[PDB]
Amino acid sequence: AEFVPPPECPVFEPSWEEFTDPLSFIGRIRPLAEKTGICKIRPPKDWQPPFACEVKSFRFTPRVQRLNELEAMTQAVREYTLQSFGEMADNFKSDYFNMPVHMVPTELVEKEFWRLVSSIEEDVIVEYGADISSKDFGSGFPVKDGRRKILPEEEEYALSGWNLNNMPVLEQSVLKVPWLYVGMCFSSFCWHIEDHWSYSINYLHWGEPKTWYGVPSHAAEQLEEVMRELAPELFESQPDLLHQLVTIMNPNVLMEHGVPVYRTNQCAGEFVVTFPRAYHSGFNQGYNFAEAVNFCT
Numbered sequence: 521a522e523f524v525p526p527p528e529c530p531v532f533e534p535s536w537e538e539f540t541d542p543l544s545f546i547g548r549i550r551p552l553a554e555k556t557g558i559c560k561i562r563p564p565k566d567w568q569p570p571f572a573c574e575v576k577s578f579r580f581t582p583r584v585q586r587l588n589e590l591e592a593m594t595q596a597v598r599e600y601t602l603q604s605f606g607e608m609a610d611n612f613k614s615d616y617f618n619m620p621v622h623m624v625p626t627e628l629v630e631k632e633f634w635r636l637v638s639s640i641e642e643d644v645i646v647e648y649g650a651d652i653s654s655k656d657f658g659s660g661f662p663v664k665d666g667r668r669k670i671l672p673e674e675e676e677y678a679l680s681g682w683n684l685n686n687m688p689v690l691e692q693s694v695l696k697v698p699w700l701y702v703g704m705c706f707s708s709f710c711w712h713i714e715d716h717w718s719y720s721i722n723y724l725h726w727g728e729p730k731t732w733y734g735v736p737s738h739a740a741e742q743l744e745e746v747m748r749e750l751a752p753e754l755f756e757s758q759p760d761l762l763h764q765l766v767t768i769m770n771p772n773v774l775m776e777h778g779v780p781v782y783r784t785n786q787c788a789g790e791f792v793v794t795f796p797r798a799y800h801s802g803f804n805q806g807y808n809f810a811e812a813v814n815f816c817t
């Protein structure tokens with residue numbers, strides 16, 4: 521009955537020498553990490569960027585997420601500040617589990633998330649501050665843009681190769697900016713790959729962990745076949761870009777069908793890299809703040 525956690529994806533803890541450049545580092549770990557689809561990177565302990573969003577004016581209208589909307593086939597929106605969203609998020613989680621938010625084990629949130637996704641008896645609705653452009657209120661990383669103050673001790677982070685604003689994003693051919701995610705408990709993203717099969721890199725600036733699931737690219741077609749077998753018939757014929765709006769699937773279902781799935785809890789201050797055509801999905805353990813961008817090698 522209970523969710524069975526997938527095996528853990530690789531975690532790398534590069535020394536300062538190895539931490540010199542994301543592209544060089546990712547190229548070096550690729551023989552392992554491309555076989556798990558996702559990996560986690562823990563920066564050296566002394567690498568701690570300051571949070572550089574304009575928190576005063578940070579306002580947003582999160583999207584509403586009904587966990588069991590797909591099983592349902594078988595109000596709208598409030599404006600928040602970062603602060604008021606956090607107060608709502610913590611209240612929701614502590615009320616839901618009847619304990620302080622930081623005392624809820626990550627395995628319990630995970631088990632309850634997947635129970636709720638398939639539950640026809642309990643309708644749980646959460647909110648996700650998803651796809652907030654970093655051009656709106658700024659990146660979470662400091663940038664030498666002249667649109668905000670950079671202290672001297674923050675300049676190294678504005679120039680760091682691991683600053684997501686400094687990733688190479690142009691694709692080579694003869695023929696843009698990071699996105700922000702303000703999470704609460706159970707807010708989620710369903711299974712998808714990136715446009716152009718790009719890499720993506722994801723940084724959790726602060727807050728409670730983000731739980732990830734990843735599938736290596738050599739199993740992409742197997743996952744797509746399981747999806748096509750088990751997706752609602754009304755959605756079976758949809759183009760992939762539209763189907764990926766609603767590709768919610770319990771990782772154990774994929775695993776029972778022979779699809780390799782790995783998991784990780786991304787904690788604050790840690791990066792998650794997804795490799796080309798590595799399907800991934802996840803959910804937030806609680807109030808947090810993430811930044812993500814696609815890049816090409």
Ligand SMILES: O=C(O)c1ccnc2cc([C@@H](OCCN3CCCCC3)c3ccccc3Cl)[nH]c12
Nearest residue numbers: 648650651699701708709710722764765810812
């Ligand atoms: O939330 C996270 O931390 C997270 C981590 C890794 N990848 C993703 C992908 C999403 C979202 O993409 C929405 C679609 N936009 C994508 C970027 C801008 C263009 C259109 C998404 C996809 C499915 C269902 C819900 C959500 Cl929010 N969130 C992710």
Ligand SMILES: [Mn+2]
Nearest residue numbers: 712713714720
């Ligand atoms: Mn993604």
